[PDB]
From a paper:
We solved the 3-D structure of the [name] [name] gene product, selected on the basis of its conservation among pathogenic fungi, and thus a potential target for new antifungal drugs. The structure of the protein unambiguously revealed a PBP fold, despite a low level of sequence similarity with previously known members of this family. [name] is an α/β protein with two domains organized into a C-clamp shape. The two domains delimit a large groove and are linked by a hinge region (residues 82–87 and 184–189).
Residue numbers in the entry: 1 to 306
Write the structure that this text describes.
Amino acid sequence: LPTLKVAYIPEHFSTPLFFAQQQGYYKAHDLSIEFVKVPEGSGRLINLLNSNEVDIAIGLTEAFIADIAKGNENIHVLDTYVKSPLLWAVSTGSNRDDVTDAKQLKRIGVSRIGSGSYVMSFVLAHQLGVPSFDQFQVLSNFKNLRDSVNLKDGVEGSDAFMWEYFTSKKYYDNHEIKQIDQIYTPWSSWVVATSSDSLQAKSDVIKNFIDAVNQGIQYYNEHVDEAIEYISSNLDYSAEDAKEWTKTVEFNSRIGKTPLDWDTIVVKTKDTLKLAGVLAESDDVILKRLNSNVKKTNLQLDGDLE
Ligand SMILES: [Ca+2]
Ligand SMILES: [Ca+2]
């Protein structure tokens, strides 16, 4: 089996991936996996797939679905990594008399254009009943986002930004920032994606990787105790906050055993984004693009007789 470069995001969600390596599940499947850490989200994950720097990427669902719907026929969504929805938290400065409610938002700080923090701002706007936001401050990283809403020097100011709850919880407790709203993703939060190159060149190995992840997920499920320790000792999460998170997340224990849920990964995602104004492409154009690049089956090895 050819070597496999897997791009991931160093968060609590990547826990199952770690234990799969710790317990040597990858090697057990005759695999040689080179993990590539991507601290700045799915945006770079897609770029890495486009440049063939990596074979597989584990990122947010909407990121890949939208990219495909926008005409990237070289991106393939293989399966679901996380079944439970992502909880987005809306934050603002510690002392902002001008910002107390979500409907008061005008300037929206985002890591990058097209990111989750950007896309979800539209979804939030639609649920609030207000028109989508048009003022965006590209701040690149999480810290800049916090400094921005606090109107700190060196960065452009913002009214609010959106970031994963448990990742932002630390800064609510030390009162650096202030939560004004939350919002779940209508869809499953994480998926496993690959490129057209890797899919036709390294299909058999990708399958084994998914199977290894399946075991990594089962181990996690049976060893939350160790998961809590790992997350709090290696990632920016307290043991208590890490524990709270474990009671909200549900990794796809059926990953590789059954096709992804079309309704939650594709239908809800496209219908929400389209309705929110994120996607301008027509429905049947989006459908046709997703029907070709979103798996409705599981990967399979060649039969003995070819
Ligand atoms: Ca195209
Ligand atoms: Ca290529």
